[PDB]
């Protein structure tokens, strides 16, 4: 499981450059925090989707957990391997298949089971080689989606207790996502501790809690239901949408910014 009991953290000097990896020493001369009051308590096979404005702090509590930010005040409980998955779809030089089990015991079930939920079998049929592809490094020539799947696919594949997905659901084949989403996240890991950092109202819906940051800070915790009863403004306005979770990911953080500024 995952708990995190009133956890602050600072700008630490050399922190924000990891995040442009993945001006601040003057964040950091001046010791703001980065989070701030952050307490949620996720329970083993939960899923929590994180969402909210833009630039509030989302991959930095991502980090927090990997221990790459030094929590100030606070307790952060959680234990065992954990699998990290980045806005940045990285890609190794090798194939499609190497890429994805890299550095871990081959399985033949297991990895049929990833690429098959991760909706890769719709790419790699494409392909004369198939999943044998060679890919060069950065996989250039690749679609921004594909890279995200075969990133996806290769956290997945990881055996871990805990799963870091940061926003891997943000371009354009929408409906593929939509598949993705309900295969891979919902199904074949629904045993699994995992954490899901998005811009879909869909995902907020199917979650088991739900943390939306807002400069820095908690602007809510806890369940679908309680959103739409505690903050309701909020819930009005973006739940009463055609189809906003086939906008494009910059629309949506467009609206949820907006919204989160309106009823602070
Ligand atoms: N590449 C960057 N250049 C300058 N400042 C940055 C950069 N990445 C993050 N920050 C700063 O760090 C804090 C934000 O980051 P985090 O990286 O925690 O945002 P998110 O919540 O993950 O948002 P985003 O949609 O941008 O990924 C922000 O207040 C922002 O000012
Ligand atoms: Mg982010």
Redesign the pocket.
Known sequence: GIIMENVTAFWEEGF?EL??KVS?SHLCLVGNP?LKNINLNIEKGEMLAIT?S????????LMLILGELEASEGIIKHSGRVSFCS?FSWIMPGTIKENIIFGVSYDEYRYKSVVKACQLQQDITKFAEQDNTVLGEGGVTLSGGQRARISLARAVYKDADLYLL??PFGYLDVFTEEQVFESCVCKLMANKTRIL?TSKMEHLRKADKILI?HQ?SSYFYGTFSELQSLRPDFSSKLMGYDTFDQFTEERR?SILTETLRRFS
């Open positions: 924000g995040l442009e601040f980065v909210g833009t630039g509030s702090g989302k991959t930095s509590l806005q940061d926003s950092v940051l820095g953080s």
